[PDB]
Amino acid sequence: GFIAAHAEPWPGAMLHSRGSTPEGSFTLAAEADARATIGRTTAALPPAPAHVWTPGPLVVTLFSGALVGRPDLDVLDGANALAIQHPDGWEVVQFREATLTADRTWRLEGLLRGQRGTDGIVGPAPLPAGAAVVAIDTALVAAGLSADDPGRALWWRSGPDAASLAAAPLRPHTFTAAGLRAFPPAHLRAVVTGGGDTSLSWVPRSRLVGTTWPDNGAPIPSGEGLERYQVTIGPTAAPVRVILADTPAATYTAAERAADGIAAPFRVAVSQISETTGPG
């Protein structure tokens, strides 16, 4: 569970202590070096096309620190990645560069989406006007969590070491990183066939390994355990036919269409439900 801390002009260690109890029996779980570089979004952006740089002008006022405009190659090997506050998984964009527009404001450009399902959170919900965007950094702290802790809203003291309880904000919080597995929607190749036999091929897309493309004989593996890819029926928000299939191929039948209502070119959205966890 990542907890980068935006210290307000504070010099010293930041003690993050996690206590399940509401009252506040926190046990130290993490320590932060200093104010992390953080940013505040001032704009709302529709989801960028996956895997292509998109020059949306994303204006972010940096809470702490300054952004860096850089060559795309560095970001390709991983450099300019910032995780905006987002519904479900925080959306992290590998934008090629950021352009200063103001002292705190930096315009992220060439936004890249869909890496490890970065686009997966965005497609359902476009980014809100205000969000907290955090650069990946040493200050970000993810260790110290037991396996049992995720899925439980443990109150987390999140403040400087001297500060405690109310002073270091204690917030009940839960983390779902394991749940985030298989974030990219499985590659969808639905093929409509006579008898309404739409085979919604779902080549596995794996978040933890990344969206690997076979290169020099290196095909995409699993690492998300098992995922039952889901088909969302186009006519109705709740799928009339709910099929979550571990198998990538999911051929449809005329009988389902006859019994209920399924469109021949029905739009299908892959909900990445996972056998290992829940929807991911």
């Binding site: 895997h51 740089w53 020059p55 450009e109 020099n216």
Partner: protein, 212 residues
């Protein structure tokens, strides 16, 4: 692959494929050139995507990389609506075709040639330029030497002699005369009997000012 993402490949393919591109001939390109779209850089072009004057400035992901123009690929000029194929040294201008398309709506009629002459059913509308009128010989004309497809009252005006032989596409062209004014082509056998044969005729209709 990992080395080149499918999208990296896609962008490269779209750029290499001939793209109609707008040459506004400005020192600086439009503020937002769309992805997979470019603004032609004139010689003396500068600014973003100013690399190489005579190139094309294309914005992908906010970087307006200027693609090297490929000879034989038609980077047609959208702004002047001028076809321009790169000659490898210059933006060579190809045949050019408004805000008013010169639309073509060829009228296809297949009158059976009968008696001695049959006026073609295919009709040229007012304001329709006739590049030419076809005289396909669908069936062997009996006794007919030639398809005299001509402007009404003048079979000889264009295509006076096109052999009326089975299986021959006797296209006749009104090259010096563009008859925008409406004309019903008259097809006559050349001092001959049209009966027993069929003529397939498409009359070129070109209308300037047509909406897009």
């Amino acid at each position: 692959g990992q080395h080149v993402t499918h999208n990296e490949a896609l962008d490269m393919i779209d750029a290499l494929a001939p793209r109609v591109v707008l040459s506004d001939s400005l020192a600086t390109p439009p503020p937002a050139p769309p992805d997979r779209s470019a603004w032609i850089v004139p010689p003396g072009g500068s600014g973003f995507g100013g690399a190489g004057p005579g190139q094309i400035a294309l914005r992908l992901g906010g970087v307006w990389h200027a693609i090297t123009p490929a000879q034989g690929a038609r980077w047609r000029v959208l702004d002047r609506g001028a076809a321009v194929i790169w000659s490898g040294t210059s933006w060579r201008p190809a045949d050019v075709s408004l805000g008013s398309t010169l639309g073509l709506a060829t009228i296809e009629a297949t009158v059976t040639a009968t008696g001695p002459s049959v006026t073609a059913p295919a009709l040229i509308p007012p304001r329709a330029i006739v590049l030419g009128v076809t005289s396909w010989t669908v069936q062997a004309v009996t006794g007919a030497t030639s398809y005299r497809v001509g402007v009404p009252g003048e079979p000889d005006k264009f295509g006076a002699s096109l052999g009326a032989a089975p299986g021959s596409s006797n296209i006749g062209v009104v090259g010096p005369f563009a008859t925008y004014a409406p004309t019903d082509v008259v097809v006559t056998a050349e001092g001959a009997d049209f009966t027993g044969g069929t003529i397939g005729l498409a009359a070129s209709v070109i209308l300037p000012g047509a909406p897009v």
